[PDB]
Symmetry: C4
Subunit: 189 residues, 4 copies
């Protein structure tokens, strides 16, 4: 459970998945956005970087299995419930979409034009992207005589819970040692 | 009973500085937010603020809406102070004002950009002042369906050239006050 | 005297004539360049900002008459004489560029043999010009007109020959009563 | 360690970092000069260094010149350490790039199989070249001219395998027996 390996990977993930990430966290969150375009650009950047991860990462990474034993990312949006001037009820509605690698690979990407991604920011509490990545620590392949395999449970949160006109973008990564699943490491062929 | 949350007033002001101040770095330069040292950057900053107001519906991430100004109309007021024309020039200062309605900004091309008002003579310019009202709702602390209180933001952007040193100091002031919502529409909402 | 007006103007001049000036000085010098392209771009930027000063400045400025009652900027270069590669012989070449020379379309000065620098033997390039400015806060109260003459100098120092050129901006302000002189935008 | 004009050695090394490290901010990131988090950035930074060496003549503001290697032929060496795919489990490949190879249009070297890196088993890439420089502040009087030989080395360090490559720039200056090579003028 090498803290350095867990930590060094997280920094690299912030640079890969957070559009415009300056290199240092802004406060408790990694960065923020103040406009609808920047919010959409940041959400779509994270998704497109996951899709193309194979040709981006400089690590010994691979896609990981999710709760259903499938590879892909989940996108959740929490909105205040609407009704029939201020058309909002305090009841929160949670919508989710699972995007498989085939869905992202499709040309044109039909997911971008979905009604799910037409956000209503005036009643939006947050958007949460979540995906799993499997990585190997090669500094222990020769030491242990069996590679230290890690499972990263990555989560990107676009928190708009303040409703102050700024969205705080958080990047969480939970690493856990695991056994090898014989999953393909991006670079190897 | 005090009902204004300082955090909500201040968090919104930070966001307005990002929306209306062109190139705003994220932190204030000194007592003023940012400065400009050329005529182009000065015009670009003036025009950026007006165009951001115009397109606010598609920019803001808050629960905002346009607010009725001092005289009950919708829109933003631009003002310029300048030493009156003379042989190199009390009441030596001349104050010209211009009220731009939502329809004036919506014309494509906005005819306001080509106005003689916006042809500034920087050698005798004291300052330019942009002023507009925004209404906002704190959803985190309403906890009620009807009777939502709204923060009335009395926003002002000042382009101070009173020093005449070659630098224009850009200030952003925002005065929040709790008020009745009074039937004004929240940008992303529909029925 | 009004130090604030002298210093506030120097800050503005650094933003107007120093290409890419970040807003704060780098060390004792304002900024530096590490390539020939950046060095040429910085020299030409200063000159072109002088030429177009009328449509750039936010102050109450005007061009200043040089020591010999002339309008324009002077550009001086210091190159080593053809050495090995006397103590040391340096070739100090100068060019005076009048406002009519800068106004000529196309600018023939850019294509001059003067501006074909040999950086391996270049000690420095120095751009110098005069600007006259008025402090309108001295006319706000009484009717006494306080005028200033700025003796501006931009120096591209390659005297170390270490691969970096240090760019210094000096400005000497002197209170000299104006004589109904031309100010940008006045009619 | 004699005739230690430390200022000249260090002033040149700063300028080298600006010429050969792509996007170098002006100050080192930590113990290394800068880092890269994507394969495209890693390739752009590698190729930027090589292309700046190729065009050094039209870039440098110093009194520089190319330096000869043990080969007695001017050029840069690129080395890559990879884990053997499958006592030594590391594989070291090295190439030399002549100035004629860099000068040919189109540069055929960019499209070579040597430059198709497998980042999952890559430990590091190392560009290494020699540059000769003269300190003109010691020839002024026509007495004793000091010639320096800079043994520059850029390292793209992926030994952590954490997804970030640390870029180190080294420069070893030595006063040598001045063999007055073309000083780009």
């Amino acid at each position: 459970l090498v803290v350095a390996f867990k930590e060094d990977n997280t920094v690299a993930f912030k640079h890969l998945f957070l559009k415009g990430y300056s290199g240092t966290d802004e406060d408790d969150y990694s960065c923020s956005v103040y406009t609808q375009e920047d919010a959409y650009e940041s959400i779509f950047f994270a998704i497109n970087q996951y899709h193309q991860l194979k040709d981006i990462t400089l690590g010994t990474l691979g896609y990981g299995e999710n709760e259903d034993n499938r590879i892909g990312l989940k996108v959740c949006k929490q909105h205040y419930k609407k009704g029939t001037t201020l058309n909002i009820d305090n009841d929160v509605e949670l919508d989710c979409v699972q995007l498989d690698l085939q869905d992202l690979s499709k040309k044109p990407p039909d997911w971008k034009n979905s009604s799910f991604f037409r956000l209503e920011f005036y009643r939006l509490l947050q958007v949460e992207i979540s995906f799993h990545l499997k990585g190997i620590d090669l500094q222990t392949i020769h030491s242990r005589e069996l590679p230290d395999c890690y499972v990263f449970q990555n989560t990107i949160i676009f928190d708009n819970k303040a409703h102050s006109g700024k969205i705080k973008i958080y990047f969480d990564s939970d690493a856990k040692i695991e056994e090898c699943k014989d999953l393909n490491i991006f670079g190897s062929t």
